[PDB]
Every structure is written in structure tokens, then in C-alpha cells.
Amino acid sequence: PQITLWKRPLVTIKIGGQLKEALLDTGADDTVLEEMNLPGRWKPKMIGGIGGFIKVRQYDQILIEICGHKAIGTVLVGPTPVNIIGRNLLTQIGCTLNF
Amino acid sequence: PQITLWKRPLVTIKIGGQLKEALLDTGADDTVLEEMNLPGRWKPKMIGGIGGFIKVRQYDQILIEICGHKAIGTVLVGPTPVNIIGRNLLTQIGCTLNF
Ligand SMILES: CC(C)CN(C[C@@H](O)[C@H](Cc1ccccc1)NC(=O)O[C@H]1CO[C@H]2OCC[C@H]21)S(=O)(=O)c1ccc(N)cc1
């Protein structure tokens, strides 16, 4: 589809058998999701933006479905205020900026 | 143009007569630029990011050119890790997400 930017680009995603709302964020290098209890191994990581850094858990090869489009890659989990779909997965669903 | 997301969507902007690199950031409601001198009045404001809140100077009705496209709107200036172009300006240049 085509998503205008009048409002926040929030879409429904599916991860770990759960449905969530997430932001399609071209400004985010990597996907970061609100705290959740994913199974599997993970590695600690810190990501920075406006306001400083937060500590997150980096899971690899996580399957995410974004508006019916399937994607698999790195998913960070931590105390982010919003679920954020980053470029690492936006590329896998064929997402582009157009103006 | 059509911008893919394998790399950061960085573009050259023109503001206050100066050229700069900025990130097209669909996850940002507002436009936040690194420290710089801008003409015109400004009020103190606060914005929150993934890591907390920062102090910024709010400039209203600022002309800014993004890849040749002209926009006039609010520009926040403060200690952001990177110049980000938010939806308040992305809408003015007719920017959309497409997948
Ligand atoms: C600052 C950017 C270069 C990077 N950020 C993505 C960005 O889209 C955030 C993503 C974001 C969105 C909402 C809340 C927190 C973070 N938006 C943001 O900070 O916007 C602020 C300015 O306009 C306002 O609108 C939202 C917050 C304000 S980030 O959240 O810090 C981030 C950094 C690294 C990763 N892997 C994932 C996300």
C-alpha cells in the first residue's frame, strides 16, 4: 500500500504469535520492540537517539509479519516507548520513500 | 525520487543559507537539527526520544529546502545525535511510504 505521513505510520505486525502496533521508521537502523519475553538466545546492546541510550536485547533471525509481508532479521527488545520497525526489516518488505 | 532503505535515507538540506545532511525520519513527528545559528525568535521547548527528553529551541515558519523541495514549518534545534527531518516537513514535500 501507500502510507501518508499526516499521522504516525503505525501498522499491525505479528511477532512470536502476538499482534502489535509498530511504527514504520526510516530513521531507525534496526527494529526495536517494547519489552516482551521472546525465547531464544540474545546479546546485550545499547542504542542511542534523542535523550540518550537504552539497553536492549538483540535477538537474531526473528520472524515478523508486517501487513501480510513476511520478514526475518534482527529484533531488539527493550524499554522503548514505541514499537519501531527499522530499515533492517523495512527493506525486506519492499518499503521505499517516495516524493 | 524513490528511496530504498538499504542505507540511511540521508539527503542534503538548505536552511538559513547553509547546506547540511539530514535523515528522512518517518518515525519523528517533528524536525530536530543539531546546534546551529538560525535567524528569528525562538521559544524553549522539550522533545522526548527513545532515551528521554532534551531541551531544544523552537523556530517557527522556517524555510528549508529538501532535495530541491521547499517546505516552511517548525524546526527544533538542540543536542540531537543527527539532523532528522520529521513528518511535519515530510508531508510538505509530499513524502509517502510505499510497500
Ligand atoms: C533519532 C533517530 C536518528 C533514531 N531514532 C528513530 C526515530 O524515528 C525516533 C523513533 C521514536 C518515536 C517515538 C518515540 C521514541 C522514538 N523518533 C524521534 O526521536 O522523534 C522525535 C522528534 O519528533 C518526535 O516525534 C517522536 C519522538 C520525537 S531512535 O528511536 O532513537 C532508534 C535508534 C536506533 C534504533 N536501532 C532504533 C531506533
Domain range for residue A74?
1-99
Mutation target vs B (from A12, A30, A97; most B CBs, 10 A cutoff): A97
Give the three-state DSSP class for B75: strand
Cβ proximity of A15 and A63 under 8 Å: yes
Cβ proximity of A35 and A43 under 8 Å: no
DSSP state of B39: S
CB atoms within 10 A of CB A73: 17
Cβ proximity of A32 and B49 under 8 Å: no
CA B67 to centroid of chain Cα atoms: 13
- Per-residue cell: B30: 517533528
C-alpha–C-alpha distance, residues A21 and B37, integer Å: 38
Residue B89: its H or E element: helix B87-90
Cβ proximity of B74 and B31 under 8 Å: yes
Q: Is B47 on the interface with A (CB under 8 A)?
A: yes
Q: How far is B40 from chain A (nearest CA, A)?
A: 24
> Which own/partner contact pairs does B39-45 have at CB distance under 8 Å and 24+ positions apart?
B42/B77, B45/B76
Q: What are phi and psi of A39, to 5 degrees?
A: -80, 165
* Number of compact structural domains in chain A: 1
Atom of ligand 1 nearest to the CA of B47: 28
Task: Clarify whether A25 is annotated catalytic.
Answer: yes
CB contact under 8 A, A4 and B96: yes
Q: What are phi and psi of A46, to 5 degrees?
A: -125, 135
Residues 6+ apart with CB under 8 A from A85: A11, A13, A22, A23, A24, A25, A28, A31, A64, A66
Atom of ligand 1 nearest to the CA of B87: 23
Q: Entry resolution in angstroms?
A: 2.0
Q: What is the CATH number of the domain that holds B4?
A: 2.40.70.10
CB contact under 8 A, B26 and A29: no
CB contact under 8 A, A25 and B23: no
Dump strand ranges (E) for chain A: 2-4, 10-15, 18-24, 31-33, 43-49, 52-66, 69-77, 84-85, 96-98
Residue B90: its H or E element: helix B87-90
